[PDB]
Design a protein around this ligand. Structure first.
Ligand SMILES: Cc1ncc(COP(=O)(O)O)c(C=O)c1O
Ligand SMILES: *Cc1c(COP(=O)(O)O)cnc(C)c1O
Lengths: 399, 399
């Protein structure tokens, strides 16, 4: 009677999280963490938004029960989500072509979609960008879906390689899923222009793809409505699509696990039929979703006063990151870098590829106490006026 | 192109959660909800516990960040969970043989265990009592495991059929998983005696089963420690086991999704190796767990003054249910029932198997507005002094 657990092989280190335990252990003073994807403020802290604290006080005074939510969560949460993604007065909403389930984070939204697709459709293949968020492949593989990669980044020009993106998707067939980042591509910060989004929307229709949008950073590129232009171009042309969205970053609600999976089909009758199977996939996973984070979002979005506070806090975050992008480039020059880092200014969101090699990312860590993901992705929101000069001196030393 | 969603078949209703939907829509003022397993107080409400409101007020004023938890959640939540399960000073704890992940509810803990087994071991079959919670089968089937049923309930004598149980399980092979309810069996309310638990533990070892304990009602049968006696007899003999526990009910934190998956192995090296893969399965599901409800639990169990308040609140819930069981049986005789219902006094927890047929349950709903599960399972914790007479009048009218 051998043990069931004896033949188990240890799992490797998570590329984004295996770094953060290694940082908490580093006993050297002045270590700098440019790793995980949370926003920091000017003091190097990840604070709770004021609008979130106000909403939580209201919930504390007014909640009378913790009784289970429905499988698909708080109804007002789904309605507010659809307005954010598609626009108030969107035809998708008036025609009742969309259904939204509240999920545990954006990751939970991707997993719910994966399980739904694997069990209820003939989907076998998901196409994701090279590079992408590393957990994309793990989520879809957990449902038994093959993940293929399409070309995306021109590492010479630090730009979108649009010709190669098109050519690399030539073999994506009708009924394959193609995954797009809605804005603030993770990790490159390079997003399609509006004309490129429109080109992709037309191509997607002709080839019969099922688009799946991962929308974790709405509001961090240009603004809430501007950042959804690409999704709304797809939505104007497609009968069917899926949107996995996250409120982890734009509400600073990371650890409360607040996301949404939104299904769109040709008509009300079809999406309700499909959504009933998505609810069955949720029930066999975590049963029903956590209330606290989504109650906060629904409260803020339903209250004109709180929503005005939140939108300003989101603008404040967006502008800080842009300020840091400029300061990073200026300070690298001041500290003597001869490589041109000006592409950094053109990139959107929290993350840019620095262009550093795994070998330089390792030298920064072991020699200077500066922590970046081994792909060379650095979190610009982890940079402050206080840590920018040491950080830049370190990069310049390993160049 | 024909749509990917066009030919999806609609999912059937959940036998528990679909009932709740019907109950909401029912416009009759006298309707009575004996379906879903939530606790109601003497006034028919599902309250937030006082210990929980106090912990939530502490969190509101002292939380400074919502930054992601680690994949396995709050460390103190895991330590407190193991103490509750195995007891302060257990050798599993001092030998470092146990690892706990915070999960989204007991359901999420079940799905995480199932995914982990399916993807990292040779396990193929899970054995589940007949009857059991209806969602057990969906969770294990959705992870790719086969579900087999073992005998349990003697429907004529309203008792545990221990000879049938043991002969059923002689077909379970070594390396199969056998699922046990820790206490307050759902739906029958009939649990093994300590002497039967000890018989099963010895037998489990001889045959090479991997025990999986589902522990959603610790404290609702006799007490916190007494309700863990059967699990602790297993933990005394086995090299390996899995416990999926829930805080939904004994903390009234249903909609915050608070549970734990606890892995036990032969030694520290093996459990950490196994746990590394469990973390991978979580990362590919919901990434990391929701903080609010687990933080409430850990605040309460970590503070003797809050813990004392909570323990009294749990005792009060347990005693109120015991008072309704007696009131239920006495009132049925007063209302003209000629059958003996005294077996309800011998059942533990929220649920009693009433012995009503599907046709009688349907008639209770349609004609009297009394909602029970089609199996005839009734939630005693939904009974109150005020609704007892009409409820019993309805049941007598359909006998
Ligand atoms: C036996 C059993 N297992 C699991 C669960 C699920 O617990 P949770 O709501 O925390 O997911 C329940 C509660 O409904 C239960 O009765
Ligand atoms: C961070 C991130 C997620 C995960 O969002 P959570 O809400 O934390 O689960 C998903 N997709 C992308 C592209 C991300 O950057």
């Amino acid at each position: 009677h051998v043990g069931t657990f004896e033949n188990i092989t240890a799992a490797p280190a998570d590329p984004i999280l295996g770094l953060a335990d290694l940082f908490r252990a580093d006993e050297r003073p002045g270590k700098i963490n440019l790793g995980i994807g949370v926003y920091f403020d000017e003091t190097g802290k990840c604070p709770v938004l004021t609008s979130v604290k106000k909403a939580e006080q209201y919930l504390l005074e007014n909640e009378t029960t913790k009784s289970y939510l429905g499988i698909d969560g708080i109804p007002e949460f789904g309605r507010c989500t659809q307005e954010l993604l598609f626009g108030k007065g969107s035809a998708l909403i008036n025609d009742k072509r969309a259904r939204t389930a509240q999920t545990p984070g954006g990751t939970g939204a991707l997993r719910v979609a994966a399980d739904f697709l694997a069990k209820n459709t003939s989907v076998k293949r998901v196409w994701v960008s090279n590079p992408s968020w590393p957990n994309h492949k793990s989520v879809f593989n957990s449902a038994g879906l093959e993940v293929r990669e399409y070309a995306y980044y021109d590492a010479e020009n630090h730009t979108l390689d649009f010709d190669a993106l098109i050519n690399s998707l030539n073999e994506a067939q009708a009924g394959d899923v193609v995954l797009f980042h809605g804005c603030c591509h993770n990790p490159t910060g390079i997003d399609p222009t509006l004309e490129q989004w429109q080109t992709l929307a037309q191509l997607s229709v002709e080839k019969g793809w099922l688009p799946l949008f991962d929308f974790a950073y709405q509001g961090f590129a240009r603004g809430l409505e501007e950042d959804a232009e690409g999704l709304r171009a797809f939505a104007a042309m497609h009968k069917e699509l899926i949107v996995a969205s996250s409120y982890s970053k734009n509400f600073g609600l990371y650890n409360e696990r607040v996301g949404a999976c939104t299904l769109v089909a040709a008509d009300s009758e079809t999406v309700d039929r499909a959504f009933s199977q998505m609810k069955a996939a949720i029930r066999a996973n975590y049963s029903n979703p956590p209330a606290h984070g989504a109650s906060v979002v629904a409260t803020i979005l339903s209250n004109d006063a709180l929503r005005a506070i939140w939108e300003q806090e989101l603008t404040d975050m967006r502008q800080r990151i842009q300020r840091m992008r400029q300061l990073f480039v200026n300070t690298l020059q001041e500290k003597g870098a001869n490589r041109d880092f000006s592409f950094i200014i053109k990139q959107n969101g929290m993350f840019s590829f620095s262009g550093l090699t795994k070998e330089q990312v390792l030298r920064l860590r072991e020699e200077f106490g500066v922590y970046a993901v081994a792909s060379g992705r650095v979190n610009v929101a982890g940079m402050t006026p206080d840590n920018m000069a040491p950080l830049c001196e370190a990069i310049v030393a390993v160049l």
